[PDB]
Write a protein that binds this ligand. Structure first.
Ligand SMILES: [Cu+2]
Ligand SMILES: [Cu+2]
Ligand SMILES: [Cu+2]
Ligand SMILES: [Cu+2]
Ligand SMILES: [Cu+2]
Ligand SMILES: [Cu+2]
Ligand SMILES: [Cu+2]
Ligand SMILES: [Cu+2]
Ligand SMILES: [Cu+2]
Ligand SMILES: [Cu+2]
Ligand SMILES: [Cu+2]
Ligand SMILES: [Cu+2]
Lengths: 278, 275, 278
């Protein structure tokens, strides 16, 4: 349960770019604890986040965010001289805003949504190598009153992997029937995909939930998405369908056949998953 | 008219058969398998028990998008709810209306344009069965939804429409004024862009704006990928009159290679001008 | 903020198809002034446009429009024998309508939206050769009260080009901070793309702007699109982010690396751009 508070706090966080095993690179909030996808960044509309960023690698890296407000000096592009030299540090500043009525009378949308950050300088001047190595992460910006979940899982379709994992190796995620589960879904690389969840549908809008009986957003369980698209939704685990090993996968047929599959294990209260047998 | 509130327990029997030259299909009676398979329509609240029978020499399953089912009705080998050659099984699909949850949020109803397909032929994601023609449309209506005079199903399965040979349509006929409903499904390996000459729709659940407050983009072109489903209703010839109105994938090599047909909109006397 | 009036005017223009340098083809409103993309046609909901069209080329060409009302006589296809022979002429007629309640109580959508026109006859019966050559252009149909921009810019992703240009030639677009800028984005050809704008987001709906605090459309800065997709939006240039050279690009990694990139040059009031090299 819960709802998002009105935002406006100034926050600081340490971020590191680190080599990981397998030629992979990752972001982390703590030295030695980088992860792919990188750490989830949660902000409420109006918050400011000062990211004290350190590049612990032997090659330049950058941090570039979708959707938030930044001045060009926190762009994370080499083109604007906001990348980070090997061993260097720099403070990237992100700002967010509430919606509101402009003086001209139009409506200014807020920053709330499902967003992401990624490298922009490794391999190419668009971060093609660093994205491919794992330098991407989720950003959620909440509007005041937004329903909060019991858990949030990030699913990144990165070329032909999920979260840079080997073919047919999840990730799986667990919930109990009735848990309010939040999915952040991000795509990267060269390929278009279609993201599909067995047993669970969501609304194709900002929060993934219909606002009420007046909301005309299509209700879907299958969504085409391409490089750098990002969306999210919230579902009630097992709602209307019960416990089980509920597949999610890319529905591009060869993509699922070659490994782009994982499991949303929905448990009964006693912890069991009927008919689940790997 | 419009659609009623649902809550009926419906039954249907569905067969999977082989068809000419390696294709495979679903049907309501044997020897009558079609590609795409039979349209299933429900009202939110309805339950459907599909008495399924596999008539083929290989396993098959029935898996549906969007509807409520238990893990036992998955239609996946993974959960052992596939059907062995010659075997039978009853799949149960449920639907629900929208309403406020216990937690105060709004729960979406089942209404939408959906589809069902095989999941075990060729691969454990049904790649061979989908290619062969094992897919069909499902419509679930909300109470009050306007009913059409006709419903046509267009599936973009890899480089074909409805598994037909290149440059063979299908065409669909209507008369000016008809309320024409289109179920559009995509399957296989390619993205596509579905496009209709002369008619636009709203990019929302019904394909029609709710009213003057519906901000949905109005479009005549929509990108879709494998297992995307959507639908819409148009008044044929509205504002444009009768004639042979093209629809096609708008990916240029795709239309060029034959993903194209004609929506033949007839004058009340039955003649299509310029055709 | 100035607004679109109600429509209902009958407008007339002349349009020519002409060969252009580099084995190209384009539309223009005056002989010898064709461009790629073709001239922007703007209509108010309910206006009619009669296009006095001439084919100055040695192959059949045509004019086909998305989104607008036309009879098969102006369909623009060899199917409905509405193409234009070499040297020939023809008058194409487009109509638009306002929205309203039908007899049966259902709501008829207006013509308002971001649309486009292209050839349908060169190369094949689907205009593949014409579209590749540059026979395409934008159409904006405005609804009464729609907010009017200070400038409109058309970005067409045509196969692996922007506006048929060579790789890494932009185009760039200039604005001043505070300007209300309108983007028209059209895709053509064989491939999918994902349009991305640095520092500026918009609403995934008809206008690119949220109606108010009840509009649930997702706010995005990244959007997958395929051949003959069209959408548009207005942004306040630099809002929340400030002046600077703001990148836009296809976010498919190999597409950006290979030059599907341009610049949204947002200038301070004095015309300078921080950190940019003119
Ligand atoms: Cu970028
Ligand atoms: Cu995929
Ligand atoms: Cu499914
Ligand atoms: Cu990006
Ligand atoms: Cu599946
Ligand atoms: Cu296609
Ligand atoms: Cu068209
Ligand atoms: Cu499926
Ligand atoms: Cu066409
Ligand atoms: Cu591209
Ligand atoms: Cu960006
Ligand atoms: Cu077209």
């Amino acid at each position: 349960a819960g709802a998002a508070p009105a935002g406006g706090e100034v926050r600081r966080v340490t971020m590191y770019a680190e080599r990981l095993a397998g030629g992979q690179m990752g972001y982390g909030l703590e030295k030695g604890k980088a992860s792919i996808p990188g750490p989830l960044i949660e902000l409420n509309e109006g918050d400011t986040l000062h990211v004290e960023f350190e590049n612990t690698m032997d090659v330049p890296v950058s941090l570039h965010v979708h959707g938030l407000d930044y001045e060009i000096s926190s762009d994370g592009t080499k083109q604007n001289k906001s990348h980070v030299e090997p061993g260097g540090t720099r403070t990237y500043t992100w700002r967010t805003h509430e919606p509101g009525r402009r003086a001209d009378g139009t409506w200014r949308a807020g920053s709330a949504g499902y967003w992401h950050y990624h490298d922009h300088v490794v391999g190419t001047e668009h971060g093609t190598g660093g994205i491919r190595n794992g330098l991407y992460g989720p950003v959620i910006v909440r509007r005041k009153g937004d329903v909060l979940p019991d858990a949030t899982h990030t699913i990144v379709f990165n070329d032909m992997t999920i979260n840079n994992r080997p073919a047919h190796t999840g990730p799986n995620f667990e919930a109990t029937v009735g848990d309010r589960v939040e999915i952040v879904m991000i795509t990267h690389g060269e390929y278009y995909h279609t993201f599909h969840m067995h047993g669970h549908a969501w609304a194709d809008n900002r929060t993934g939930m219909l606002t009420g009986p007046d909301d005309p957003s299509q209700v879907i369980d299958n969504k085409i998405c391409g490089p750098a698209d990002s969306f999210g939704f919230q579902i009630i685990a097992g709602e209307g369908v019960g416990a089980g090993a509920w597949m999610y996968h890319c529905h591009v047929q060869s993509h699922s056949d070659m490994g782009m599959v994982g499991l949303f294990l929905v448990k009964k209260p006693d912890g069991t998953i009927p008919g689940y047998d790997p």
